[PDB]
Each structure stands twice: as C-alpha cells, then as structure tokens.
Amino acid sequence: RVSIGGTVYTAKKYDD
Amino acid sequence: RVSIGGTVYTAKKYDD
Amino acid sequence: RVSIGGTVYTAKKYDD
Amino acid sequence: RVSIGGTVYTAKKYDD
Amino acid sequence: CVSMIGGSR
Amino acid sequence: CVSMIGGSR
Amino acid sequence: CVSMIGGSR
Amino acid sequence: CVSMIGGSR
Amino acid sequence: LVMQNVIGTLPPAQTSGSTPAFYSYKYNQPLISQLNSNSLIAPLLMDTSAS
Amino acid sequence: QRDLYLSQSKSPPCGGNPTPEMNTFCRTAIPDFISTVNFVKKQNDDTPKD
Amino acid sequence: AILQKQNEQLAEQKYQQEIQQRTSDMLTAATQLVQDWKQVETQVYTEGT
Amino acid sequence: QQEIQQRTSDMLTAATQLVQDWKQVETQVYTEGT
Amino acid sequence: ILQKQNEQLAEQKYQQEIQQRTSDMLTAATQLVQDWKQVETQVYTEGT
Amino acid sequence: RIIYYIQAVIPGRAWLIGSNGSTLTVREGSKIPGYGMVKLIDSLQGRILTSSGQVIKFSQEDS
Amino acid sequence: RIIYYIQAVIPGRAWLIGSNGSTLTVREGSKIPGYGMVKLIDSLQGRILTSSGQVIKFSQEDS
Amino acid sequence: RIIYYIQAVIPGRAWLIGSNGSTLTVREGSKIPGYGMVKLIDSLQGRILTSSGQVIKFSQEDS
Amino acid sequence: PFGAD
Amino acid sequence: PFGAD
Amino acid sequence: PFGAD
Amino acid sequence: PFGAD
Amino acid sequence: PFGAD
Amino acid sequence: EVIDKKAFKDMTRNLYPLNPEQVVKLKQIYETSEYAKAATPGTPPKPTATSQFVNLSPGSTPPVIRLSQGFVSSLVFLDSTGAPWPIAAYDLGDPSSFNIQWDKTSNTLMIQATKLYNYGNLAVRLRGLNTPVMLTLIPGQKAVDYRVDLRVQGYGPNA
Amino acid sequence: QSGQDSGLTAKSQAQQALNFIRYASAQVTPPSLPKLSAYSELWNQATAKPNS
Amino acid sequence: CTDAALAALEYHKSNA
Amino acid sequence: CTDAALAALEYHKSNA
Amino acid sequence: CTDAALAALEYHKSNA
Amino acid sequence: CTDAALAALEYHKSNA
C-alpha cells in the first residue's frame, strides 16, 4: 500500500 | 473396396 | 475420442 | 483456478 | 459429449 | 457403403 | 469469483 | 489515503 | 522564407490527435477549399466577409 | 545517439513499428565500458585455481 | 588480499543488470502512463433542434 | 526425433487455416419484396 | 567422457525453453489485450 | 403406441417426426414420451438409442 | 413451492425464470426464495447449487 | 434507524442511498446518521466499515 | 467410422 | 473442463 | 486483491 | 471392374 | 506529504 | 503393389494431417479458449432499471448513473406529474470516456461507457428548466443502470 | 446492368461516364507521397528547435 | 463380380 | 460402433 | 466438477 | 482482507 504524498506505508501481515 | 468412413476392408479372391 | 472439456478420454477396444 | 485480484489459489485433487 | 466421428472400433 | 468401382475380382 | 473454465478435475 | 487495490493480505 | 510562410507549421508523421498528419482529412480540410478550381469559376459574386 | 532517439519516441526509428533489435536498442541504456575492462580478474580466471 | 575484493566488486557490477533492464522497461511503460493521464478530453455541446 | 517436428509443422499449417475459417462469421443478407 | 559432455549440454539446454515459451506468450497476451481494449461505438437508427 | 422416425440428425440435437405429425428436437439426454430417455445419438448412422432398448431410425419411406 | 429453470447462465450472472413467469438473476451469493442462498453457478453445464440441496438447471423442454 | 445501501463506490467517495430515498456520499472519515462515522471504504469489495460495527453493503436486490 | 453405416 | 457436461 | 471479494 | 458388364 | 492528509 | 498401400497411408497422414478426431478436438480448444477470453471475471453487474427523484435544491448530491463497459444506459427525464420532459440540450464532460446518443427532440439519453471505470459528469439543459440537470456517471461496478427514471423536481411542458 | 465484379466497375450509363472521367483524369495513378522512414527523419530534423 | 462385392460387404458389416 | 461409443461416454462420465 | 470448484472457493475465501 | 488495510491506514496516519 502507498499513500498519495509519495512515502510508502504498508502493513506487515494480516489475514482475514 | 473402401467404405465412407475411410477404413479399408477388402475381400480376398472371388470370381463369377 | 475427445470431449468438449478438452481432455481426451478414449474407449479401448469394442466391436459389434 | 484463478481469482480476480491476481492471486492464484487452487484445489488439490478431487473427483466427481 | 461424444464426437462420434472422433470414433474408432 | 460399397464403392464397387473400387472393385476387383 | 471462481473462473471455472480453467477447471481441473 | 489507502488504495485497497494496492492491497496485500 | 516566403514559401515556408506558405506552408506554416510542417505537419507531423502519423498522428491525428493533438496535431494532424499531412494525409489526414482533418488537416486537409482548409487547404481543399484553396486548391479547388470551382472556388474561382463557380461563385458569381465573392463574399469578402470573414465567415 | 540514444538521447537523440528517445527525444524522438514517436516518429521512428524509436517509433512506428521498429525491427526487434532496434526496439531493444531504444530500450537499452548504455553501460560504462571503462568499468568493465580489468586485467587482474581476467588473469585469475585464466590461471587454474590449482 | 584486496585483489580478490576488487574481483568481487567487478563481479557484483557484472551480475547487476537485472536492475537496469527492468528500469528501462518501466520507463517505457511509465512515460506512456504520464501521457495518458496528461490527456484531457474536451467537453462537447449538443444544442437540441 | 525430427519426424516429430515435421509432423507438428504440418499440424500447424493445417490448424491455422482451420482457426481462420472459424473466426469467419458472414453477415445475413436481406431481400425486400416488390 | 562423451556421456559427461552431452549430459552437460542437456543441462545447459533446460533454461531457454522457458524463454521461448515466454516470447510466444508475448505474441499471445498482447493480442488478447488489444482485442480487449477495443470498444465499438453504439449505433442508432431513426425510424421512418 | 406412437412411432416416431428421424426427421434429421447432427452431432448433438436430432429432430424427429412422429406418426401424429408432432416434431421434436433432442440432445444427449432428453425425455421422449414412451421411449424413456435417450442414451446415444448416432448421427452418421441416423440412429437414436434410448433407455427402453428400442432404436429410433429414419423412416423406411424417407431414408 | 415455485420451481425456477435456467433461462441463461454466464460466469457470474445467472438468469432464471420461474413457473409463474417471474424472472430473476443470481450472483455468487444471493438469496433465492425457497432455495435459500446459492453456493455455485456452473455456466458451461448450467447448474446452480444452492443451500437446500436443490440444483437449478435449464428447463427440460428448453435445453 | 435508517438502513443505507450503496449506489456507487470508488476509491475515496461512496454514494449511498438510504431507505428514505435520500442520497449522500462518504469518505474515509465522514459523519453518517446512526452508523457513526466511516472507518474505511473498500471499493473493490464494495463494503464500508464504520465505527458502530455496522457494515454498509450493496443492496441485496441490486448487487 | 462405424461398420453399421 | 468437467465431466458432467 | 482480497479473499472477501 | 467386373466380368458381367 | 504528511500523515494527517 | 504394396508400395501403393504404404505411400497412400503416408498421404492420408500428410495431405490431411488432423484426423477427424483431431479437427473436432481442435474445435473444442478453440471454443474453450474463446470462452476464456470473452468471459467477464467476477460477477458482472446486475442489469436493473431504477428510478431516482432529482433534487435541485442547493446542498443535494447529483444523481448517480452506474454504467457498464460497452453497455447502453438509458436516462429518461421526467417531471413531477408523471409526464415526459424533453431535452433542450446537453454537455458531456470527459466525452471520449462515454459515447452518448440522442435524437434531438426526445427526452431520452443513451450513454455507453467507453473506458472501464473512469467516471465523469454530465449536464443536461431541459426544456422549461433554468437550473442545470447535473449528474454523475460512474462505470464498472457490480450493477448496471439499464434504465433510470429521473423524477426531476420541476414540472415540464406536459402535465 | 452489372459489369464484371473485378475491382472498379460501373453499373449504369452514368456510372460508365463517371468511370471514364475518373480514368482520363488519371487519379487512378495517385502521386507517390514520401516514405515513412526518410520523411520521419527529415521531419524531426526540420521541426526540432535549433541549437538545443 | 458380385461374389467379391458380397464377401466385401459382409466383411465390412462384420468388422465395425 | 455403438458399444465403443457407450463405453467411451461412460468413461467420460466416470472420469470428470 | 463441483467438488474442485467448492474446495477452491473455500480455499480462496479462507486465504485473503 | 480488511485487517491489512486498517493496519496500513493506522501506520500511515501515525507516521507523518
């Protein structure tokens, strides 16, 4: 996942 | 002598 | 002989 | 067998 | 299902 | 079934 | 979801 | 802020 | 210089989007009236209004 | 030459329908050649480890 | 000594082209993405009869 | 081993014309009476 | 010796079949996606 | 009973005409009144086999 | 109850028509009265499997 | 309360239609009567999770 | 190809 | 490709 | 790409 | 090709 | 580019 | 004369290479591959005909038209009393993303989404109505607006 | 009437006259416009901003 | 003549 | 003829 | 047939 | 599914 400003933010591991 | 399916079967020897 | 699934399943030997 | 997102998950072995 | 012209005795 | 032009004694 | 044309028995 | 198509389980 | 002024901007190679090609109808649309002969012999009283 | 080509993305050679190798050329950036020429490693490759 | 370190430096340089190849690839893709977001299709009016 | 790829060559030089005749769908014709 | 070398040639062989199937896949996949991006404009006919 | 004869047949569907003038079309598996359920369609022989053991042919006067 | 038959079926959409003339559509998960909710939709064979074990197929006189 | 189904959902906004015929639109954070405020919108699945645990989902007869 | 043709 | 076609 | 699609 | 032609 | 966007 | 038999067999395999078995099986891989290509992944949109009351008061959100790629969406414009409202004109912003057909007299608009999910908006000048009919067209969702009856807040030239 | 359906063919007297007038005017031999490659090269040569 | 034809057609209808 | 076909079809049904 | 389809389906809905 | 989305959302909100 990536924001709109440019810097990348992503979760590690999450299942459903 | 050949039938329509393409397989060929023949008689051996017959005289009239 | 081939079906409409694409897997070719064939009969072995049968005469009549 | 394949989903719409892109990830591929497939059943192992079954018959009917 | 059977394509009989794909047939063989 | 027979094509007798393909015939032979 | 299931694309069953890519079926495998 | 989150684009779900950039999603990963 | 004069005959470049006759063309103006030279048309690009193969594109009908932002700018048209030399064989496209859209680029040819204004020059076709210039190059037609009945543009001179057919009309009877010319219109000088920039329509 | 590659800069002149990429400034002309359309209007082939880099445009239109390039022949495959010239497509790879338009694709391929130019490496630095003076970083590749090194005699000591080539020497070690030539001589057997034994 | 440092001879073999320089050896593995140029070896590392010479195994290091996958980066540049996919680089060039996605520049070619990316500039086309830039162009087709820069595109703006102008509005059209239809005046009824 | 080569008889195989010559086989496959003649297979495709038949299969491509089969596939091209199957994409062919001819539009209906209309005849309106007098 | 001879066996060793043709085994090595066979070992080296089993790397380019993937890339040739990959190229055939370029020919196939681009053609599909070009088919797919095609949209054909709806047509209207006004009655007499 | 009502005896039907083949009107035409191709791989899959087979169109059959009865003695009452009724015309029907069938597939691999279908319910034929009295005839039961069709097991096989031999188009190149013009033959229909159904579960009741009897066989549908082209009529003697149209084949 | 009211018995529906398949009027059409594609990957995803499943068009069905009942015996009362009503016509509906189904997706992967949908509530169908009497039949509960559907599990699966096979379009190439035309079978809709729902909760109550009943399978909707093409009509016998329509397939 | 008033139960809301969605008429449209895209990354970002989502156009909602309640049972009163009122149409609204929501973002990642927006006040919705009864349901609290939106916690997240998933356009790919067509869901909206809110603070109140209530999940907003395309109407059963339109999804 | 069948023999009952 | 299934067998209940 | 999620499993709840 | 028969002998009763 | 901030985290309160 | 055995040469005739054997070389004839060699011919019935080269001139006609695919056996009658093989040609129908090739047909099958055809129809299955094409059945793969044209088949829409996921569940395609529900084609339904809705009806929305258009509110022109300030603060109201524009009506939504959920369209489909390559599919005709029919918008009919309707006054309060239940009578048709003919169109004076319209402007379609983002036009090469939605192809619009309209006979110049009727009240009925035909839009086909040209690209899959990129959305836009559409302004419609009505006959007796001064306020613009502003709507939002969103394609590519789980539902397709096969018809929509816009219950525009005003009264048209038909009562 | 219908002439031989091999390329351009007229169907009426007026169509024959039109086919003549086309064929005497010799538009059927259109002039050769430039080649794509050479023209493309001289185009981006003559369109580009000089000294940059 | 006809003897060969009859033997042939019997051999054809006997072998499927 | 028909026996080969019925054995084939039953084999196709048995092996999906 | 259905067994593989449903096993795959549950495997997808279990694995996000 | 949603767990990864919400975790990444909170991670982006927490990291400016």
Side-chain angles (χ1 to χ4, degrees), chain V residues 43-67:
Chain V
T43 282
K46 291 229 158 188
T48 88
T50 61
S51 158
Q52 180 266 5
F53 166 76
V54 203
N55 324 56
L56 330 179
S57 317
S60 64
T61 89
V64 171
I65 320 88
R66 36 107 193 194
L67 323 94

PDB file of all heavy atoms in Angstrom, chain V residues 43-67:
ATOM      1  N   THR V  43     -18.334 -11.280 -10.541  1.00  0.00           N
ATOM      2  CA  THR V  43     -19.712 -11.290 -11.011  1.00  0.00           C
ATOM      3  C   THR V  43     -20.005 -10.022 -11.810  1.00  0.00           C
ATOM      4  O   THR V  43     -19.764  -8.912 -11.325  1.00  0.00           O
ATOM      5  CB  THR V  43     -20.686 -11.402  -9.841  1.00  0.00           C
ATOM      6  OG1 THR V  43     -20.733 -12.761  -9.388  1.00  0.00           O
ATOM      7  CG2 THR V  43     -22.079 -10.984 -10.270  1.00  0.00           C
ATOM      8  N   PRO V  44     -20.507 -10.172 -13.034  1.00  0.00           N
ATOM      9  CA  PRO V  44     -20.815  -8.998 -13.843  1.00  0.00           C
ATOM     10  C   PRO V  44     -21.907  -8.174 -13.193  1.00  0.00           C
ATOM     11  O   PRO V  44     -22.591  -8.641 -12.263  1.00  0.00           O
ATOM     12  CB  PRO V  44     -21.278  -9.600 -15.178  1.00  0.00           C
ATOM     13  CG  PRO V  44     -20.806 -11.001 -15.168  1.00  0.00           C
ATOM     14  CD  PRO V  44     -20.767 -11.429 -13.750  1.00  0.00           C
ATOM     15  N   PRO V  45     -22.100  -6.936 -13.638  1.00  0.00           N
ATOM     16  CA  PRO V  45     -23.087  -6.070 -12.986  1.00  0.00           C
ATOM     17  C   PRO V  45     -24.506  -6.600 -13.126  1.00  0.00           C
ATOM     18  O   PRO V  45     -24.857  -7.254 -14.110  1.00  0.00           O
ATOM     19  CB  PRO V  45     -22.923  -4.732 -13.718  1.00  0.00           C
ATOM     20  CG  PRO V  45     -21.608  -4.813 -14.412  1.00  0.00           C
ATOM     21  CD  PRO V  45     -21.405  -6.247 -14.738  1.00  0.00           C
ATOM     22  N   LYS V  46     -25.321  -6.317 -12.113  1.00  0.00           N
ATOM     23  CA  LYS V  46     -26.755  -6.588 -12.200  1.00  0.00           C
ATOM     24  C   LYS V  46     -27.417  -5.563 -13.106  1.00  0.00           C
ATOM     25  O   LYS V  46     -27.402  -4.371 -12.783  1.00  0.00           O
ATOM     26  CB  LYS V  46     -27.414  -6.539 -10.823  1.00  0.00           C
ATOM     27  CG  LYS V  46     -27.037  -7.647  -9.872  1.00  0.00           C
ATOM     28  CD  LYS V  46     -28.307  -8.243  -9.272  1.00  0.00           C
ATOM     29  CE  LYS V  46     -28.089  -9.648  -8.742  1.00  0.00           C
ATOM     30  NZ  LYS V  46     -29.363 -10.296  -8.326  1.00  0.00           N
ATOM     31  N   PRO V  47     -28.000  -5.963 -14.228  1.00  0.00           N
ATOM     32  CA  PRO V  47     -28.731  -5.008 -15.071  1.00  0.00           C
ATOM     33  C   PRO V  47     -30.119  -4.757 -14.511  1.00  0.00           C
ATOM     34  O   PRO V  47     -31.001  -5.618 -14.591  1.00  0.00           O
ATOM     35  CB  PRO V  47     -28.777  -5.715 -16.433  1.00  0.00           C
ATOM     36  CG  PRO V  47     -28.750  -7.168 -16.090  1.00  0.00           C
ATOM     37  CD  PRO V  47     -27.919  -7.301 -14.841  1.00  0.00           C
ATOM     38  N   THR V  48     -30.317  -3.582 -13.919  1.00  0.00           N
ATOM     39  CA  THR V  48     -31.636  -3.262 -13.388  1.00  0.00           C
ATOM     40  C   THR V  48     -32.042  -1.851 -13.787  1.00  0.00           C
ATOM     41  O   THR V  48     -31.201  -1.013 -14.124  1.00  0.00           O
ATOM     42  CB  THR V  48     -31.715  -3.406 -11.852  1.00  0.00           C
ATOM     43  OG1 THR V  48     -31.338  -2.180 -11.224  1.00  0.00           O
ATOM     44  CG2 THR V  48     -30.806  -4.521 -11.346  1.00  0.00           C
ATOM     45  N   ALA V  49     -33.352  -1.612 -13.771  1.00  0.00           N
ATOM     46  CA  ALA V  49     -33.938  -0.319 -14.108  1.00  0.00           C
ATOM     47  C   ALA V  49     -34.427   0.334 -12.821  1.00  0.00           C
ATOM     48  O   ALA V  49     -35.396  -0.131 -12.212  1.00  0.00           O
ATOM     49  CB  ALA V  49     -35.077  -0.481 -15.112  1.00  0.00           C
ATOM     50  N   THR V  50     -33.761   1.409 -12.413  1.00  0.00           N
ATOM     51  CA  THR V  50     -34.079   2.122 -11.185  1.00  0.00           C
ATOM     52  C   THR V  50     -34.858   3.395 -11.496  1.00  0.00           C
ATOM     53  O   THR V  50     -35.132   3.728 -12.652  1.00  0.00           O
ATOM     54  CB  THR V  50     -32.805   2.446 -10.403  1.00  0.00           C
ATOM     55  OG1 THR V  50     -31.951   3.278 -11.198  1.00  0.00           O
ATOM     56  CG2 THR V  50     -32.073   1.174 -10.026  1.00  0.00           C
ATOM     57  N   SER V  51     -35.219   4.107 -10.432  1.00  0.00           N
ATOM     58  CA  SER V  51     -35.916   5.383 -10.547  1.00  0.00           C
ATOM     59  C   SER V  51     -35.477   6.264  -9.390  1.00  0.00           C
ATOM     60  O   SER V  51     -35.628   5.880  -8.227  1.00  0.00           O
ATOM     61  CB  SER V  51     -37.433   5.187 -10.536  1.00  0.00           C
ATOM     62  OG  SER V  51     -38.098   6.374 -10.141  1.00  0.00           O
ATOM     63  N   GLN V  52     -34.934   7.435  -9.707  1.00  0.00           N
ATOM     64  CA  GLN V  52     -34.420   8.361  -8.710  1.00  0.00           C
ATOM     65  C   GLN V  52     -35.119   9.706  -8.840  1.00  0.00           C
ATOM     66  O   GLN V  52     -35.324  10.210  -9.946  1.00  0.00           O
ATOM     67  CB  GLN V  52     -32.902   8.543  -8.858  1.00  0.00           C
ATOM     68  CG  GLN V  52     -32.273   9.491  -7.846  1.00  0.00           C
ATOM     69  CD  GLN V  52     -32.146  10.911  -8.367  1.00  0.00           C
ATOM     70  OE1 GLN V  52     -32.619  11.231  -9.458  1.00  0.00           O
ATOM     71  NE2 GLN V  52     -31.503  11.772  -7.587  1.00  0.00           N
ATOM     72  N   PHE V  53     -35.472  10.289  -7.698  1.00  0.00           N
ATOM     73  CA  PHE V  53     -36.071  11.615  -7.651  1.00  0.00           C
ATOM     74  C   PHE V  53     -34.954  12.648  -7.627  1.00  0.00           C
ATOM     75  O   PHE V  53     -34.117  12.640  -6.719  1.00  0.00           O
ATOM     76  CB  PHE V  53     -36.971  11.778  -6.427  1.00  0.00           C
ATOM     77  CG  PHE V  53     -37.353  13.204  -6.148  1.00  0.00           C
ATOM     78  CD1 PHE V  53     -38.318  13.836  -6.912  1.00  0.00           C
ATOM     79  CD2 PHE V  53     -36.738  13.918  -5.134  1.00  0.00           C
ATOM     80  CE1 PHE V  53     -38.668  15.149  -6.668  1.00  0.00           C
ATOM     81  CE2 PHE V  53     -37.086  15.232  -4.884  1.00  0.00           C
ATOM     82  CZ  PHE V  53     -38.052  15.847  -5.652  1.00  0.00           C
ATOM     83  N   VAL V  54     -34.947  13.535  -8.614  1.00  0.00           N
ATOM     84  CA  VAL V  54     -33.903  14.542  -8.743  1.00  0.00           C
ATOM     85  C   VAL V  54     -34.253  15.726  -7.853  1.00  0.00           C
ATOM     86  O   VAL V  54     -35.320  16.332  -7.998  1.00  0.00           O
ATOM     87  CB  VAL V  54     -33.734  14.984 -10.202  1.00  0.00           C
ATOM     88  CG1 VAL V  54     -32.348  15.565 -10.419  1.00  0.00           C
ATOM     89  CG2 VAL V  54     -33.977  13.816 -11.128  1.00  0.00           C
ATOM     90  N   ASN V  55     -33.353  16.054  -6.932  1.00  0.00           N
ATOM     91  CA  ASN V  55     -33.491  17.222  -6.075  1.00  0.00           C
ATOM     92  C   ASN V  55     -32.546  18.300  -6.590  1.00  0.00           C
ATOM     93  O   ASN V  55     -31.335  18.072  -6.689  1.00  0.00           O
ATOM     94  CB  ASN V  55     -33.183  16.897  -4.611  1.00  0.00           C
ATOM     95  CG  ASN V  55     -33.649  15.507  -4.193  1.00  0.00           C
ATOM     96  OD1 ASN V  55     -33.285  14.497  -4.795  1.00  0.00           O
ATOM     97  ND2 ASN V  55     -34.457  15.457  -3.142  1.00  0.00           N
ATOM     98  N   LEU V  56     -33.098  19.466  -6.919  1.00  0.00           N
ATOM     99  CA  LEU V  56     -32.319  20.574  -7.453  1.00  0.00           C
ATOM    100  C   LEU V  56     -32.018  21.632  -6.400  1.00  0.00           C
ATOM    101  O   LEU V  56     -31.395  22.652  -6.714  1.00  0.00           O
ATOM    102  CB  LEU V  56     -33.041  21.203  -8.646  1.00  0.00           C
ATOM    103  CG  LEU V  56     -33.929  20.295  -9.500  1.00  0.00           C
ATOM    104  CD1 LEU V  56     -34.582  21.096 -10.611  1.00  0.00           C
ATOM    105  CD2 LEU V  56     -33.127  19.143 -10.087  1.00  0.00           C
ATOM    106  N   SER V  57     -32.448  21.413  -5.163  1.00  0.00           N
ATOM    107  CA  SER V  57     -32.153  22.360  -4.099  1.00  0.00           C
ATOM    108  C   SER V  57     -30.660  22.340  -3.781  1.00  0.00           C
ATOM    109  O   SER V  57     -30.026  21.283  -3.846  1.00  0.00           O
ATOM    110  CB  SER V  57     -32.954  22.025  -2.844  1.00  0.00           C
ATOM    111  OG  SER V  57     -34.294  21.699  -3.169  1.00  0.00           O
ATOM    112  N   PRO V  58     -30.073  23.491  -3.455  1.00  0.00           N
ATOM    113  CA  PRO V  58     -28.650  23.516  -3.088  1.00  0.00           C
ATOM    114  C   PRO V  58     -28.378  22.635  -1.879  1.00  0.00           C
ATOM    115  O   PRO V  58     -29.166  22.585  -0.932  1.00  0.00           O
ATOM    116  CB  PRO V  58     -28.390  24.997  -2.788  1.00  0.00           C
ATOM    117  CG  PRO V  58     -29.442  25.726  -3.555  1.00  0.00           C
ATOM    118  CD  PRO V  58     -30.653  24.842  -3.518  1.00  0.00           C
ATOM    119  N   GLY V  59     -27.248  21.933  -1.919  1.00  0.00           N
ATOM    120  CA  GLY V  59     -26.858  21.010  -0.872  1.00  0.00           C
ATOM    121  C   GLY V  59     -27.113  19.554  -1.193  1.00  0.00           C
ATOM    122  O   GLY V  59     -26.592  18.682  -0.485  1.00  0.00           O
ATOM    123  N   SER V  60     -27.892  19.260  -2.229  1.00  0.00           N
ATOM    124  CA  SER V  60     -28.194  17.889  -2.607  1.00  0.00           C
ATOM    125  C   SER V  60     -27.111  17.333  -3.524  1.00  0.00           C
ATOM    126  O   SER V  60     -26.488  18.065  -4.298  1.00  0.00           O
ATOM    127  CB  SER V  60     -29.554  17.810  -3.302  1.00  0.00           C
ATOM    128  OG  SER V  60     -29.543  18.530  -4.521  1.00  0.00           O
ATOM    129  N   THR V  61     -26.891  16.023  -3.427  1.00  0.00           N
ATOM    130  CA  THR V  61     -25.875  15.416  -4.278  1.00  0.00           C
ATOM    131  C   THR V  61     -26.469  15.050  -5.637  1.00  0.00           C
ATOM    132  O   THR V  61     -27.655  14.716  -5.726  1.00  0.00           O
ATOM    133  CB  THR V  61     -25.293  14.165  -3.623  1.00  0.00           C
ATOM    134  OG1 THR V  61     -26.074  13.022  -3.990  1.00  0.00           O
ATOM    135  CG2 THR V  61     -25.294  14.308  -2.108  1.00  0.00           C
ATOM    136  N   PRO V  62     -25.667  15.112  -6.698  1.00  0.00           N
ATOM    137  CA  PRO V  62     -26.189  14.798  -8.023  1.00  0.00           C
ATOM    138  C   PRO V  62     -26.554  13.331  -8.124  1.00  0.00           C
ATOM    139  O   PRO V  62     -25.970  12.477  -7.431  1.00  0.00           O
ATOM    140  CB  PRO V  62     -25.023  15.151  -8.956  1.00  0.00           C
ATOM    141  CG  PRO V  62     -23.818  15.093  -8.091  1.00  0.00           C
ATOM    142  CD  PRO V  62     -24.264  15.554  -6.745  1.00  0.00           C
ATOM    143  N   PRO V  63     -27.523  12.992  -8.971  1.00  0.00           N
ATOM    144  CA  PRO V  63     -27.885  11.583  -9.148  1.00  0.00           C
ATOM    145  C   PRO V  63     -26.771  10.784  -9.804  1.00  0.00           C
ATOM    146  O   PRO V  63     -26.028  11.279 -10.660  1.00  0.00           O
ATOM    147  CB  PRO V  63     -29.129  11.641 -10.045  1.00  0.00           C
ATOM    148  CG  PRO V  63     -29.588  13.070  -9.998  1.00  0.00           C
ATOM    149  CD  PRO V  63     -28.356  13.882  -9.791  1.00  0.00           C
ATOM    150  N   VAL V  64     -26.692   9.517  -9.407  1.00  0.00           N
ATOM    151  CA  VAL V  64     -25.658   8.590  -9.849  1.00  0.00           C
ATOM    152  C   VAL V  64     -26.216   7.695 -10.941  1.00  0.00           C
ATOM    153  O   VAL V  64     -27.332   7.174 -10.829  1.00  0.00           O
ATOM    154  CB  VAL V  64     -25.137   7.745  -8.672  1.00  0.00           C
ATOM    155  CG1 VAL V  64     -24.216   6.643  -9.169  1.00  0.00           C
ATOM    156  CG2 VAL V  64     -24.419   8.623  -7.685  1.00  0.00           C
ATOM    157  N   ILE V  65     -25.438   7.519 -12.003  1.00  0.00           N
ATOM    158  CA  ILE V  65     -25.720   6.534 -13.037  1.00  0.00           C
ATOM    159  C   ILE V  65     -24.559   5.552 -13.053  1.00  0.00           C
ATOM    160  O   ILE V  65     -23.441   5.906 -13.448  1.00  0.00           O
ATOM    161  CB  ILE V  65     -25.933   7.170 -14.419  1.00  0.00           C
ATOM    162  CG1 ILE V  65     -26.742   8.472 -14.317  1.00  0.00           C
ATOM    163  CG2 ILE V  65     -26.602   6.180 -15.357  1.00  0.00           C
ATOM    164  CD1 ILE V  65     -25.930   9.726 -14.077  1.00  0.00           C
ATOM    165  N   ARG V  66     -24.820   4.324 -12.611  1.00  0.00           N
ATOM    166  CA  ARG V  66     -23.832   3.251 -12.634  1.00  0.00           C
ATOM    167  C   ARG V  66     -23.917   2.531 -13.975  1.00  0.00           C
ATOM    168  O   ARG V  66     -24.885   1.818 -14.247  1.00  0.00           O
ATOM    169  CB  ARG V  66     -24.062   2.300 -11.462  1.00  0.00           C
ATOM    170  CG  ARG V  66     -25.526   2.091 -11.113  1.00  0.00           C
ATOM    171  CD  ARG V  66     -26.047   0.731 -11.526  1.00  0.00           C
ATOM    172  NE  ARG V  66     -27.500   0.708 -11.442  1.00  0.00           N
ATOM    173  CZ  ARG V  66     -28.258  -0.379 -11.467  1.00  0.00           C
ATOM    174  NH1 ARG V  66     -27.740  -1.587 -11.589  1.00  0.00           N
ATOM    175  NH2 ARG V  66     -29.575  -0.246 -11.386  1.00  0.00           N
ATOM    176  N   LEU V  67     -22.912   2.725 -14.816  1.00  0.00           N
ATOM    177  CA  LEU V  67     -22.939   2.226 -16.179  1.00  0.00           C
ATOM    178  C   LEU V  67     -22.079   0.971 -16.304  1.00  0.00           C
ATOM    179  O   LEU V  67     -21.564   0.437 -15.317  1.00  0.00           O
ATOM    180  CB  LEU V  67     -22.481   3.311 -17.153  1.00  0.00           C
ATOM    181  CG  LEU V  67     -22.913   4.741 -16.832  1.00  0.00           C
ATOM    182  CD1 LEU V  67     -21.826   5.454 -16.051  1.00  0.00           C
ATOM    183  CD2 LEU V  67     -23.270   5.502 -18.076  1.00  0.00           C
TER     184      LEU V  67
END
